[PDB]
Amino acid sequence: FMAKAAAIGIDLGTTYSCVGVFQHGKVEIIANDQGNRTTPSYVAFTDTERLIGDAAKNQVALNPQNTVFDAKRLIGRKFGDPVVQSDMKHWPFQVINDGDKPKVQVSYKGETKAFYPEEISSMVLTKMKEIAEAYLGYPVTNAVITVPAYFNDSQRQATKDAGVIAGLNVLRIINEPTAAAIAYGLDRTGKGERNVLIFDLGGGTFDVSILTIDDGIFEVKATAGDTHLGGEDFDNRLVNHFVEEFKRKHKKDISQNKRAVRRLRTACERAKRTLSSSTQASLEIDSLFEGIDFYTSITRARFEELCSDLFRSTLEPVEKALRDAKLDKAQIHDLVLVGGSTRIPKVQKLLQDFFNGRDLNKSINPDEAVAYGAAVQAAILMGLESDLEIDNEGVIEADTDAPQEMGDENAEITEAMMDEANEKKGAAIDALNDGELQKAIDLFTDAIKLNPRLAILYAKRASVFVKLQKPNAAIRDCDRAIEINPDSAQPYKWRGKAHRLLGHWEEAARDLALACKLDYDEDASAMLREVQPRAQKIAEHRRKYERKREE
Amino acid sequence: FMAKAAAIGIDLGTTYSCVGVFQHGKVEIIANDQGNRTTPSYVAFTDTERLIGDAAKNQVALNPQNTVFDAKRLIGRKFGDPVVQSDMKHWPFQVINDGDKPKVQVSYKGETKAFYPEEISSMVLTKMKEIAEAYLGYPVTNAVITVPAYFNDSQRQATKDAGVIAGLNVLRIINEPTAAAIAYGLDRTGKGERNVLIFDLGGGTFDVSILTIDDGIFEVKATAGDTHLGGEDFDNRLVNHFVEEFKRKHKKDISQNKRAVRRLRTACERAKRTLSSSTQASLEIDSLFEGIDFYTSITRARFEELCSDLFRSTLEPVEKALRDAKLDKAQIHDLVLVGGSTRIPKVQKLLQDFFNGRDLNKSINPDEAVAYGAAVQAAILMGLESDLEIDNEGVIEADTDAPQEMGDENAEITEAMMDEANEKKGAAIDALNDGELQKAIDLFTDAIKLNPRLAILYAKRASVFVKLQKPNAAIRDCDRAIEINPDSAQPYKWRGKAHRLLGHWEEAARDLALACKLDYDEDASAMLREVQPRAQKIAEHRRKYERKREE
Ligand SMILES: Nc1ncnc2c1ncn2[C@@H]1O[C@H](COP(=O)(O)OP(=O)(O)O)[C@@H](O)[C@H]1O
Numbered sequence A, B: 001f002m003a004k005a006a007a008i009g010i011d012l013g014t015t016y017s018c019v020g021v022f023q024h025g026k027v028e029i030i031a032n033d034q035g036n037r038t039t040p041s042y043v044a045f046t047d048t049e050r051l052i053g054d055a056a057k058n059q060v061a062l063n064p065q066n067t068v069f070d071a072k073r074l075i076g077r078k079f080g081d082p083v084v085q086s087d088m089k090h091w092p093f094q095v096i097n098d099g100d101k102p103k104v105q106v107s108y109k110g111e112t113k114a115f116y117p118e119e120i121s122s123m124v125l126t127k128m129k130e131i132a133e134a135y136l137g138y139p140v141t142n143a144v145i146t147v148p149a150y151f152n153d154s155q156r157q158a159t160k161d162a163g164v165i166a167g168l169n170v171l172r173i174i175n176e177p178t179a180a181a182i183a184y185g186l187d188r189t190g191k192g193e194r195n196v197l198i199f200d201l202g203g204g205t206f207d208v209s210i211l212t213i214d215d216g217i218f219e220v221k222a223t224a225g226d227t228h229l230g231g232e233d234f235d236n237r238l239v240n241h242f243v244e245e246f247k248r249k250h251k252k253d254i255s256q257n258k259r260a261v262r263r264l265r266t267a268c269e270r271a272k273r274t275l276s277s278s279t280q281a282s283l284e285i286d287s288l289f290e291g292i293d294f295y296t297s298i299t300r301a302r303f304e305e306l307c308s309d310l311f312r313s314t315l316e317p318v319e320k321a322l323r324d325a326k327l328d329k330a331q332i333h334d335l336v337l338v339g340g341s342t343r344i345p346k347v348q349k350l351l352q353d354f355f356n357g358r359d360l361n362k363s364i365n366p367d368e369a370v371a372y373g374a375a376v377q378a379a380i381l382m383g384l385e386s387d388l389e390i391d392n393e394g395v396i397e398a399d400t401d402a403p404q405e406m407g408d409e410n411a412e413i414t415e416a417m418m419d420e421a422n423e424k425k426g427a428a429i430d431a432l433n434d435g436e437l438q439k440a441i442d443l444f445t446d447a448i449k450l451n452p453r454l455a456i457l458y459a460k461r462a463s464v465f466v467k468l469q470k471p472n473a474a475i476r477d478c479d480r481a482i483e484i485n486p487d488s489a490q491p492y493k494w495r496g497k498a499h500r501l502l503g504h505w506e507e508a509a510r511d512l513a514l515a516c517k518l519d520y521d522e523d524a525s526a527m528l529r530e531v532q533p534r535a536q537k538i539a540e541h542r543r544k545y546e547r548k549r550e551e
């Protein structure tokens, strides 16, 4: 057999999200369908479907009121929190009050519906998960997720909840700066006391953290920064600068066409990125306003000057952080750049100048470091079952065939489509009865293609996939059914069996027990009894480890 | 060294039980093996073994007559009490008369046996204890247990007895509503007179209590409610509603198949829970009756209407409670939701409407609040030895290794298995003699694996664990021996030593004195003499505190 299924590491960001996995001695930051190693934390709702990530951020100009972003800022907070109310006047989507809990309110297929920030976030998570499963070729259940160090118990729990919704087992919620240091192996290289500063300049926020690490244990000493200072503000500057130039050169105002503004803003996003590895950046848009083309350029120097106040303002939070730790600049051993905006040579130069030309740790991609760290720690927690004598009888080799055909959630189901699929169900249960397993699978596929929203379809196909020694395939079908209806008992029964087939001991015991509560089977009952001693020996050993690292 | 062993807080419920612990500045409500933060108060007996909690509630449909629940209703009562006789006609297990004491009578491994309600309850307690010990990684002896405020001296003592059977030292029996208020810190926030109402809607019962708290002392002003109004009745409604719909849609009666009824009932339990956080709930069962699938849904609105009379009836006990306190609605400062059924938006709305849209205290999980309070008060009572100059010589660091291999109580011991284990005993006593301690432990483990019911095995292994500075491990073995045979003197001798090794002063003095009565040792005798001054200074200080709070 090959390796067990890996655990993923996820950076759930305010502006972008990022996922990694540790395999064959190294972390892989995973690229999504559109090719990018990071994904906008965006969810959009429309007339026909739900959009997530790049597709959601790209159509914003067209659908500004049902395109949700910045769910991280709401997460774990009260509608009555001054921060939320302060925030609500900058977003173009509606936020409503639900018993002192905030919910984003949108239009979605001609009906109004609302979502807790944990729900929005769980939609992002799901996407990240899906990105990883496409890379790996198999279903993922276990994750590590990161949060800012300033996150209270409320926001932490809320971030775990979002994971649980997206079908993840959350192994650990860990601090973003802590994730960064783990990435730079600042825990395992050292045999003495070292003090560490994480300069995190992201898309929406700026975070300075000083951490102390002795004996391989992280302790947060100070936190600071600005929860409203990010790369998105620099885009404002460029945008503001160019609108004004457009007035000057072309004698027209463009502020009021939203679509022309975005087109400018996205052009500016790209331009700012090029200005990190080039001194100059060209900027061409076909037909910006009333048929007028905009061809222009900008220099690094000029960009720097437009953001003048902003860039300089990242040294004050540094000053304040040392001040809270009771440390002098000289006393920090390690400087670490994370966040995508730290790609900006000026922002780099300013920091190095504060530390008198000392070397910055930046070999690890600054926008990938958090996820990187998260993946390493995910690998360690899973890795912990190495130390235990676990009997591996009954475990089989992971099936690797390509993902079977699923439904289409949003495709139109006709009245006749309900029946034709309904018949197929009965025809496939006959092939299982008779003993021709592939035929049973094949007609369930015709059933599912025709009715993609009947949850028993997926569960029953999953049953057949198990008889066929294809547990991953079953896990997939059960994952879908449980999405459609988390209350039906069948899918838990079969996912339990599938997990057990794969040595996923803790996963098997959760499902088989849940299946037994909802709908008692003698079989599942014994499966669970057979499964428990493995799950609790693993769980006890992981808990012990974490207690040792809680000190 | 780490912290001393914590005391647990236990909510011994009519329908569910719940355990918590206070550590590192906060209460942890502890999850059981199957993942749930609450455990059904169920004990089942069968052909081969004894089942407790979720496993007991899940197989009910299969074994209705030897599956015991509602022991709380019998506890502390006379067979001749009209309540018991009234109750006996709703249960499917047998209750018998034993000198005007009631005992539940069951089949258990092909023999008929009977159990006092305190014994049934002590089986639940044990489970809770075991849940906590798995979480903590070490044996627990000290607990706080909760009871309803209407409990007489008889029922209180009986509840303490059940704790004592399960091997707990019962620090305090405290009122459930009092536990709830302690959880909401309604004792320590206030510097004036405040009046408090606890609206407790559980699984079997409804409790309204009004409490007055000045100077940090709780006083019960009034009690009311219905000892037969709970969540289990709402399940009746849903079940009744669906059976009737099944007749209507599918032209068949299902009342007579018990297994189909339960499957419906458990489906309904889940559905009712979803209807707390969703307006609608889907309901799928594979093959309900004679091969017919039941796929159907229900709305929140509809559920509300089915329970119409029931929900509305919780305001009368409120009315009556104020009336007994001589208070108007306006005069209550604090409203507190506890009980799992208070998760129901309708039940919430009705209450708030009686108090004219005023805020309810519900931030603490309504089904976890009682246990929560109990854990806090457990922490205070233990915490009391902070104020005393206790000399800590001879105390060593708690051993944290994983739990050693125990027996299997219910596994079949062959005649040959008695001898092979018997030899191993003699072989291990030789390794102790010679001085190789691990070998002695290892061969006792082979002895125990082969004969899991000889109590001297466990005691002798415990002796070796002590020589090895692993007192927790010893405590475990002694706990087991004393379960098998509470009269043998050896285990008390060694548990005494182990406790003393850990600073468990009062625990050490109980065991060492009991060991000295049954079988006098010069060594244990001096251990006890050495141990007494510590135990009695602690005991005197806890007693004083409680006297101050008895006023
Ligand atoms: N090469 C680059 N040059 C300049 N800015 C960049 C570059 N790459 C990313 N950024 C900026 O970094 C921000 C995203 O930061 P990141 O750490 O990836 O996400 P988050 O802040 O959500 O954690 C965006 O504003 C983006 O414009």
Ligand SMILES: Nc1ncnc2c1ncn2[C@@H]1O[C@H](COP(=O)(O)OP(=O)(O)O)[C@@H](O)[C@H]1O
Pocket: B013, B014, B015, B016, B017, B038, B201, B202, B203, B204, B205, B230, B231, B232, B269, B272, B273, B274, B276, B338, B339, B340, B341, B342, B343, B344, B366, B367
């Ligand atoms: N989310 C929920 N929605 C509706 N009812 C619930 C929910 N959670 C628990 N309950 C109900 O609460 C009851 C258990 O109450 P609880 O306080 O936990 O136990 P006890 O009443 O034994 O003290 C059960 O009938 C259960 O159906």
Ligand SMILES: [Mg+2]
Pocket: A013, A014, A202, A203, A339
């Ligand atoms: Mg970030």
Ligand SMILES: [Mg+2]
Pocket: B013, B014, B202, B203, B339
């Ligand atoms: Mg209760």
